[PDB]
Write a protein that binds this ligand. Structure first.
Ligand code: NA
Length: 129
């Protein structure tokens, strides 16, 4: 599914992300834009044998089980396929764990490169939720 911008903001809001750990809804929407272009099916295989899954490009080295990644942990207690669903529940719950793990939203490289320190409220302009 490719979400619309405000459609995603609304779903994220319903799932309790706005101001979760102090991160505004625009930060979350911006992260999804640059991690996956709002595509729930996005995947990326890394040279290290891990894979990033879903709308928030969550990595299998630590966060989910894909059956093929080294270490390896499953800190969100999910199969990585759950991160590829059209509904964002699993991704949101896992993101809440990640953002709480000691690096904040800096765990998302595309958020660091395109969102951090920017006027991220722009990502919810016109949504009026
Ligand atoms: Na860059």
């Amino acid at each position: 599914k490719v979400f619309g911008r405000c459609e995603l903001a609304a779903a994220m809001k319903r799932h309790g992300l706005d101001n979760y750990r102090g991160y505004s809804l625009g930060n979350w929407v911006c992260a999804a834009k640059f991690e996956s272009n709002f595509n729930t099916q996005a995947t990326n295989r890394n040279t290290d044998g891990s894979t990033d899954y879903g709308i928030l490009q969550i990595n299998s080295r630590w966060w989910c089980n894909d059956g093929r990644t080294p270490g390896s942990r499953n800190l969100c207690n999910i199969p990585c396929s759950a991160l590829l669903s059209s509904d964002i529940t699993a991704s949101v719950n896992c993101a809440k764990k990640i953002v709480s793990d000691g690096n904040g939203m800096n765990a998302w490289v595309a958020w660091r490169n395109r969102c951090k320190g920017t006027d991220v409220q722009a990502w919810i302009r016109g949504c009026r939720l």
